[PDB]
Amino acid sequence: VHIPKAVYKAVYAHLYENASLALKEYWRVGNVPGITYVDENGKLCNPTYLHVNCIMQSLESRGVVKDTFAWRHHYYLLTEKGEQFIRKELDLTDDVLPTPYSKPS
Amino acid sequence: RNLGSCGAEDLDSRVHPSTIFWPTEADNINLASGMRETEFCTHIAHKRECRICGNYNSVYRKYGLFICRRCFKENAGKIGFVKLH
Amino acid sequence: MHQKYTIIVVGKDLKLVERYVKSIVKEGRAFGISGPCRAPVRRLTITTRKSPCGEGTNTWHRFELRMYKRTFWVTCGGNDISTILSKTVVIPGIQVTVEVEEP
Amino acid sequence: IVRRDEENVYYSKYLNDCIMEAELHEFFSRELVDAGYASCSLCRTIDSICVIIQCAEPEVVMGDNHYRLHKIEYLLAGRFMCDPKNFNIWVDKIIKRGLSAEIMVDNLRAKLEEAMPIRRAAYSIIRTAMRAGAAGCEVIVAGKLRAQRARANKFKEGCLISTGHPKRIFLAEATRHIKMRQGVIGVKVRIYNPNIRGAVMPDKIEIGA
Amino acid sequence: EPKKVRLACLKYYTIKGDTAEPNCGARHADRCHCG
RNA sequence: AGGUCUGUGAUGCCCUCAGACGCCCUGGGCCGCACGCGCGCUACACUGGCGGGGCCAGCCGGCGCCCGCGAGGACGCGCGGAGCCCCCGCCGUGGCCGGGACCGCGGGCUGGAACGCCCCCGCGCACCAGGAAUGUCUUGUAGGCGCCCGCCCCCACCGCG
RNA sequence: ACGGAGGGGUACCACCAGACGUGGAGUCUGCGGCUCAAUCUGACCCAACGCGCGCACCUCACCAGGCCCGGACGCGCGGAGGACCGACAGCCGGGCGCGCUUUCGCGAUCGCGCGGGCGGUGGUGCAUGGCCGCUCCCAGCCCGUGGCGCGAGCCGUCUGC
């Protein structure tokens, strides 16, 4: 409900660098093992399912991503509108592209 | 209520610093990493559920499956289970 | 040199497992030997009610999953670290047939 | 002479990966509807994963400059927790789409969602199959097709098998669900190719001169 | 329904550059945050 | 118009939606008992019960040492299979050493938590082969004897074999 | 379709010949009734009644009580001269900054109204899909051309072995 900005930035960066996010359907207390952020917290701190789930709800509502639920897993993908939005929250300059376009093969 | 203390007699009798046995079930490492928060979900307990339809009843744990019997006949052919004999 | 290597291959269907066997035996005759051991078949069994609701005659399904396993540990010192690769890439790349190598 | 607690790792390292495949089947089916998705396969090469797809028109899923594919690869890896760039993918193309039930039934679902009547859609599907060289196709459309009191009317053309082991080789079946304003419209397809692949249907004898 | 009260001048613990409040941060004293 | 909207990110139309039919916590209940009946288990004994000994399976399969009458427990390593039956004795037609329900002291296990399950001493219910009525079965079959898995923190008179 | 009509066949979910049982008692479990704050519900000849895969917590729906919003997204208004959110002492309370006598904090992650969502083991299986059961431990079912009938229909698809 009260989400730190480090978390927002972390989620956005994870999206851009991976263009995706596959997330569990969970509502109890727990910590996501993937996306991590540092706020003087040990070496790194992991977030909580609640914050990230609220974030993702909002994003998909705005049209940034498109879900594709499955065996009780959330599969999100960022679109073009989303790219044209993530590119400015992170302060990215124009022309920059995410890694999957970087000829993985 | 940090300024709340108890007689020493009522302290050694307290449960030894041991991790409550109930560990829940993390079907995958992804689905976790260890006001109301004081009692949101303190009743830790096994919550084993189907990894398809999320129901807590009739779950084949044999062979590390974790699939409901109903949610099973459908996907059994894909998995490789077949009906012969 | 000599590393006592062992080959284990696993499959659920009996037709590729025997085809993979032949290719390997063909391609390992020189780099030492490669005679197989056929294991007892691990058969997974699941019995389920054929009904989602529990009505009518009590009728049961009988699924199973046979898993076949063969084991060529005959390389042994007869294969070096790179020599194992040679054949393993010269054998066909069947889509499904798990393989693991250990000394 | 042998311990049974050790090989359980090999046996349990096959089962997990068979399951991992099914989730992908479901996900693709819910995703690559427009690319003629049919099926999937996997190859657990230690260094990296390989997945082989069967699609009518891969260039759609390929994506300009391979963007959709790559967007997919990074995604799956997070879920199955593999290092991306070791989660590569390959796509293969189906040439006999009329022999594939999935393509047919998905096309039928599309055509139905455009309001066209069932009588035309089914028989167009069936003509398409026969042109492909098939010995039979049966279509079924059950549900609230009229005002109320749902009924099933089935269309067919040729000859079909219905029993025996041979039905697991020469008979290809599939189903879908179509959500509409009245309700749900169940649809299913089945096609019979006796001369498929190289196997020979039993009780079939050919003589000489 | 806590019975809070409203004050616009939340800035007069001091007179002029003073140290009234027991960096920064009857029954004795009860410090903000933890005890 | 057989059953399933209480298996599901299967669903049309209704009802609930900030004192919630959402979600989370603490307790209680689903087991309560003058009564009718459905599938099973244990017995009514000598073609037997008790004590001692000898010995062979299969789906498949884990063990040592030391405490404790036992159930169980502390440590440490990878290694491994039973009832009926057979032999020798006691009992001697007695609701008796057949049968083991009920109850009174006590010792332990699971678990955050016993109302749950195991062991020991004592007490020792109905029952003498079952009316009108009725079910299943043709070779390794009926019947008798036990052993594994499932669900499962603990527990099988059930179920698949 | 039916016949307390005829003629041919067939099967231990039928009989002959036999075997082993149930209905007799104690007990496990499920089913109706009584009771209770609740004793959550589906199924009722074959074709409901150890069946809807082991109920102290969860599972869980029902009974007595309490936290939280996890109110997406749009328009109007308000707000850092301070939106919303946490806490010591001391009580009330099963308990918890739940509430209370007070004053420290935190910082726009928003508040209110109007539209619109999400969710729900909530109803209808007599609105539906899918899956099962039964008819059926059956031996039967249909197409093209042709022929007979105004026609519904018949022959093919057999009153023989």
DSSP-derived secondary structure for D4-63: TTTTHHHHHHHHHHHHHHHHHHHHHHHHTTTTTEEEEEEE--SS-EEEEEEES-HHHHH-
d(CA B51, CA C72): 36
Tell whether D119 and D153 lie within a shared domain.
yes
Tell whether D77 and D25 lie within a shared domain.
yes
**Which residues are registered as beta bridge partners of C49?**
C60
d(CA E26, CA E35): 16
The DSSP element (H or E) to which A86 belongs, if any, is: helix A80-89
Query: Which stretches of chain D are DSSP H helices?
Result: 8-31, 58-62, 67-80, 101-113, 118-132
d(CA C3, CA C11): 26
In a domain, D183, yes or no: yes
Chain A interface residues facing chain D, Cβ-Cβ under 8 Å?
Answer: 18-22, 34, 68-71, 73, 75, 77, 99-101, 103-105
Contacting subunits of E (3+ beta carbon pairs below 8 A): B
Extract the runs of DSSP E, i.e. beta strands, from A1-105.
Answer: 20-24, 73-77
Is the separation of the CB atoms in D150 and D144 below 8 Å? yes
d(CA D146, CA D117): 12
Structure token digits, residue D115: 């309001």
Q: What is the span of the domain harbouring residue B67?
A: 37-84
Residue D1, classified by CB atoms within 10 Å of its CB into exposed (0-12), middle (13-18) or buried (19+), is: exposed
Is the separation of the CB atoms in B83 and C45 below 8 Å? no
d(CA D144, CA D126): 23
Nearest-Cα residue of chain B relative to residue D78: B30
d(CA C98, CA A98): 34
Cβ-Cβ contacts under 8 Å for D62 (sequence gap 6 or more): D68, D69, D91
Query: Which stretches of chain C are DSSP H helices?
Result: 14-27, 81-90
Cβ-Cβ contacts under 8 Å for D60 (sequence gap 6 or more): D34, D35
In a domain, D146, yes or no: yes
Structure token digits, residue D146: 């009229």
Among A82, A64, B78, CA closest to D28: B78
Is the separation of the CB atoms in D91 and D52 below 8 Å? yes
Domain at D86, CATH number: 3.30.300.20
Domain boundary among D64, D93, D122: D93
Structure token digits, residue A69: 């639920």
Residue from the list D26, D75, D76 with its beta carbon closest to the beta carbon of A71: D26
Domain at D117, CATH number: 3.30.1140.32
In a domain, D161, yes or no: yes
Q: Which site among D11, D16, D19 would you substitute to test the B interface, given the most B Cβ atoms closer than 10 Å to its Cβ? A: D19
Among D97, D96, D92, CA closest to D53: D92
Amino acid found at A60: E
Amino acid found at D135: A
User: Do strands D87-93 and D137-143 pair parallel, antiparallel, or not at all (unpaired)?
Assistant: unpaired
d(CA A31, CA B30): 9
Maximum alpha-carbon separation in chain C: 67
Residue from the list B30, B40, B52 with its beta carbon closest to the beta carbon of A33: B30
**Which residues are registered as beta bridge partners of C64?**
B82, C45
d(CA A32, CA A48): 6
In a domain, D134, yes or no: yes
In a domain, D180, yes or no: yes
Domain ranges of chain C: 4-99
**How many domains in chain D?**
2
Q: What is the span of the domain harbouring residue D167?
A: 101-192
Approach to solving:
cryo-EM
